[PDB]
Design a binder for this molecule. Structure first.
Ligand SMILES: [Mn+2]
Ligand SMILES: [Mn+2]
Ligand SMILES: [Mn+2]
Ligand SMILES: [Mn+2]
Ligand code: NA
Ligand code: NA
Lengths: 68, 67, 67, 67, 68, 68, 67, 67, 68, 67, 67, 67
């Protein structure tokens, strides 16, 4: 049937988790076609000094491969 | 000794992660009694042209069983 | 020594598990060279009116990098 | 907005892995509506004179809940 | 062939690990038929003035489904 | 080289996931120096009449040790 | 009560997952007594010109120990 | 929002599993305040001529931090 | 240095967890020398009908290998 | 903010763990830009007459994506 | 009877894996008494012009508590 | 096809990680035939006055069964 590929990215943002997810996906869309789903693997981040500096979300992005 | 049961749900939301959890809990409250705690097992979601179509949070909800 | 890369693919088929793995490997052959091994990570699928609709096998495929 | 539930079943069969999965899904269909997807968690089995006696596939079945 | 279902329960007891498991099974057998096996997934508990307040054992209980 | 330590904290908040993480970091920074990074290990919470009562985020906080 | 041992084998076959499991179990039968159950731990394999070369199934075989 | 800390201990006992947990909690109570919950991570132990020399239970203890 | 081997056993008992652990170890001692430690992997069991029939503890037993 | 990608490589060497890591990283440097960190995922190897033949280290290499 | 505590450290070094472990243990010795054993949890690192810049080994250090 | 067995060993050495792996493999050679691969599962060790006392590497060793 169809075949998909998964790439692992890390999105970062000062805004929050959804924004860091959206950041990776926005960059993914520049170079990968047929983006279909994602799976969060890790949530981490840096500290300083209003608390969280940046949120870092490690995620797999899954996309459909074309025929050839 | 009190006994609890855990049911696994996946809440979804186009808005965010809290909203997805809340969606699941709102539905669980309709058919399950004595809801006490939840544990998130997975965060995933779907992608469209806008980016995230929906956030999906897989979680277990634990509740106390009667008698 | 030699250096390998692993790509993660999801093969799908209505027929069964091996055919799902085979579907991923046939596509991988078109763009990847020196395919050597694979490792299954997840077996999942969709459900239709007759039972399984498609099997989906998530696998890592390992191949030698040139140079 | 949408909420799914997951139940954990063990399908068994003497015929093979796919058959064991089909067995769980067939029995699932009798009492669960909107069956959407499955996830295989464990493949195990019993052993007899002729090798495999029964294949046992532990899977989660996900299905959409009504509001 | 036969089809089984697993339900996840948490038994509790102020006495010990076995007693907590038995509490869960004793309750299970009031609403579930054909109980066959259990599998412990987690041991946790709460803490009081005297050490352990209650033991909490998270377990899966497996039972045959009737062909309904 | 440098040596870091990780401590496991659980932040809580009635507001959301980021707020819970910030609660833990805000407390961490009162007794720990040189906070560098955090890693989320679990998200759980409690349930009330209105859905989520409080969100509880389990996280590791990593900080450099002073060569003492 | 009674005591069981588990050994970890890897069965291989060009002819699929069930075939590889059966290969392991046939060999286990030759030198092990009181074979009772198996648990699949990994599925992997090698790749050749036609896709899968060999399927390799890593499993635990459980057997009762005599007293 | 209240904040908790988790410390990892290994309690040991020649008697049994509960006793090992209790050993750890008794010691934790000496230097940690507001002890609330524990989670067992590992059960292991040592072996002598008698069989089990000591049971060892690795656990996290969670307690509320002040200010 | 020294080399050890680990075998995986399943001890069973109606008495409880420690007894099922002791059961595997007693049988291990019949055929393996220099038993040194064990690690519990799984706790499961059968049901009927005073609750637990038998407790089943899956464990690795580690023992020192001799030179030759 | 910025976005990173991770690729999974297997470095090999007859000369040890660090050597295998370095082999992977040297190859990564040839076709990947902005290499920042690595995470070891598995250590395995092959066996020959003298013990270890090749050390094989599976690692993730993280690098910043240009915009 | 006996109770141990475990702390999670990250040793770093430019020299290799063993050196990074030794670095954590040396700093551990300054403030912790009765250091008994360690468990490596993660091996990771940073990458520079010459390949590995810093090795980072995340380990748990276990030590015996006084009564 | 061919069938393999995996035995789990713990190699120990004061020198380092490879020497620990080598110690396990040298002993395995005395009693096991057709040793083919190994997989590291855990790296741990003991601590003495100078830092690491012994490294202990837990590994699975895979070998072909005759027949
Ligand atoms: Mn949010
Ligand atoms: Mn098949
Ligand atoms: Mn007991
Ligand atoms: Mn080395
Ligand atoms: Na569950
Ligand atoms: Na911890």
């Amino acid at each position: 049937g169809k075949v998909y590929k998964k790439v692992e990215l890390v999105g970062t943002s000062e805004e929050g988790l959804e924004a860091a997810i959206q950041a990776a996906l926005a960059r993914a869309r520049k170079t990968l076609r047929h983006l279909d789903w994602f799976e969060v693997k890790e949530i981490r981040g840096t500290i300083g000094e209003a608390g969280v500096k940046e949120y870092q979300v490690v995620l797999e992005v899954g996309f459909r491969l074309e025929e050839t």
